[PDB]
Amino acid sequence: GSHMTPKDDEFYQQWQLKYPKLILREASSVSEELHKEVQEAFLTLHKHGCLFRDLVRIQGKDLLTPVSRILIGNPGCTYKYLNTRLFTVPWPEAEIAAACETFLKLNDYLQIETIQALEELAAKEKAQDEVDIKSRAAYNVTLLNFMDPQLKEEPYFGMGKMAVSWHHDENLVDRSAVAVYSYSCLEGRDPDIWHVGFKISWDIETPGLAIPLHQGDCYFMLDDLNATHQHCVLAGSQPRFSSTHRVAECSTGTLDYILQRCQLALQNVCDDVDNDDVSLKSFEPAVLKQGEEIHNEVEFEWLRQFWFQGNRYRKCTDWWCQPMAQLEALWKKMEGVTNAVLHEVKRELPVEQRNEILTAILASLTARQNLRREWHARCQSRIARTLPADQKPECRPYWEKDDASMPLPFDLTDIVSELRGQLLE
Numbered sequence: 242g243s244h245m246t247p248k249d250d251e252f253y254q255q256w257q258l259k260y261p262k263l264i265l266r267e268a269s270s271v272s273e274e275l276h277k278e279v280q281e282a283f284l285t286l287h288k289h290g291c292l293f294r295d296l297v298r299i300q301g302k303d304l305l306t307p308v309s310r311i312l313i314g315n316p317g318c319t320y321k322y323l324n325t326r327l328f329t330v331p332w333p334e335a336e337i338a339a340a341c342e343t344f345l346k347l348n349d350y351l352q353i354e355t356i357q358a359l360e361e362l363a364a365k366e367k368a369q370d371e372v373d374i375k376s377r378a379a380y381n382v383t384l385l386n387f388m389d390p391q392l393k394e395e396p397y398f399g400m401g402k403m404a405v406s407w408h409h410d411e412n413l414v415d416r417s418a419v420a421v422y423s424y425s426c427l428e429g430r431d432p433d434i435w436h437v438g439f440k441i442s443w444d445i446e447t448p449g450l451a452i453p454l455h456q457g458d459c460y461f462m463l464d465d466l467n468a469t470h471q472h473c474v475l476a477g478s479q480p481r482f483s484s485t486h487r488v489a490e491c492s493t494g495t496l497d498y499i500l501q502r503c504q505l506a507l508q509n510v511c512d513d514v515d516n517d518d519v520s521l522k523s524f525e526p527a528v529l530k531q532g533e534e535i536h537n538e539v540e541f542e543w544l545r546q547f548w549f550q551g552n553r554y555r556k557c558t559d560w561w562c563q564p565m566a567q568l569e570a571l572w573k574k575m576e577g578v579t580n581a582v583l584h585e586v587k588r589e590l591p592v593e594q595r596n597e598i599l600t601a602i603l604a605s606l607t608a609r610q611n612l613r614r615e616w617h618a619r620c621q622s623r624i625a626r627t628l629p630a631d632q633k634p635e636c637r638p639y640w641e642k643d644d645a646s647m648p649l650p651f652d653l654t655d656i657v658s659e660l661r662g663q664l665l666e
């Protein structure tokens with residue numbers, strides 16, 4: 242089993258004993274001006290329609306998340322959850338930018354409140370590391386969420402209606418904290434009030450917690466609580482917003498990173514003039530393995546990921562329009578690089594040099610064929626035909642065999658099997 246609410250007498254003591262790194266700051270800790278500006282910036286994004294239900298993937302199935310979301314954060318940053326990489330609507334129409342400036346200000350307070358609470362947790366634990374404390378609270382993005390109840394029951398502690406089921410927040414730096422601003426309009430828990438559920442991983446015997454959330458309430462998952470504990474969102478009655486500020490692990494998920502990866506792969510190309518005549522400087526297996534691995538990374542983790550969302554964020558900002566075309570152009574050159582590798586393996590080389598190249602690009606080429614088949618189906622599913630027109634997925638970049646603009650075709654089975662047969666015969 243069962244759950245425990247502030248009604249139960251064991252509540253406060255079970256909190257400090259099994260969920261101690263959970264910190265709740267009631268609305269009394271927010272300025273009424275701050276709460277009004279955030280709720281207005283909140284309500285502004287609902288009128289403009291900047292909150293979208295992402296088309297995620299779970300256990301091979303394509304799912305529509307019942308919660309409408311938007312990723313706001315540092316420019317050129319990303320946050321990948323459930324095989325769907327969200328791109329940041331950056332912070333410092335005019336009402337859209339004012340809201341991002343608002344949530345940037347909300348990010349500053351929560352970062353200051355997290356550092357204070359994290360320093361308090363060090364004193365209670367003690368009875369250098371200050372670089373990790375400031376780093377674990379340096380929130381780079383925030384994920385806004387919408388849920389109008391106008392539903393799966395909690396299957397472990399009898400908490401009832403759930404908006405978001407049990408999960409850990411993915412794509413987070415190790416031991417990084419999470420701050421959430423909640424905003425909503427006797428034999429258990431109140432179904433009309435919004436709660437946040439909490440439980441220990443692998444464990445349904447320890448009674449879980451149901452923290453009631455009112456307008457302006459804030460809770461903080463500190464240190465390893467996200468790793469040690471799972472959390473859910475218990476449905477209420479009135480529609481509810483939320484602002485979850487995270488330290489997104491983006492060591493390989495920023496624009497500057499993927500741009501550097503593209504330059505590294507194009508160091509193997511004579512960059513005198515952009516044309517269809519791609520001449521590779523080297524044919525060593527390592528640099529050819531690297532060039533085609535970055536080929537897959539820039540296409541599937543960025544290109545196919547961005548256009549699968551159909552540029553919903555274009556309804557908010559045009560920040561990614563130029564970089565995505567730049568990545569599209571850099572990826573087009575890599576397709577000419579792949580052809581340059583293919584045009585060389587079929588040259589009168591030796592066989593010992595030909596075999597050393599096949600083993601380098603074999604796995605990288607098949608993955609490009611398998612992932613292109615997944616993305617072709619992800620953009621064309623019975624659920625993927627029901628979104629609004631301005632949000633439907635686009636299978637970009639796509640081209641037919643008649644398309645003479647591309648040096649290589651889409652379907653690679655007539656090329657990977659010809660390459661697979663060469664490694665044998």
Ligand SMILES: COc1ccc(Nc2c(F)cc(-c3c(C)noc3C)cc2Cl)c(C(=O)O)c1
Binds near residue numbers: 305307323408409
């Ligand atoms: C019917 O299709 C769906 C799709 C998503 C669902 N919830 C859900 C989610 F949207 C996001 C996360 C999540 C992760 C991982 N990391 O950060 C975040 C944020 C985790 C979950 Cl669990 C649900 C559902 O809860 O029932 C259903």
Ligand SMILES: O=C(O)CNC(=O)C(=O)O
Binds near residue numbers: 384437484
């Ligand atoms: O809003 C909350 O309390 C947290 N729930 C989430 O779905 C999330 O963080 O994305």
Ligand SMILES: [Fe+3]
Binds near residue numbers: 472
């Ligand atoms: Fe969450």
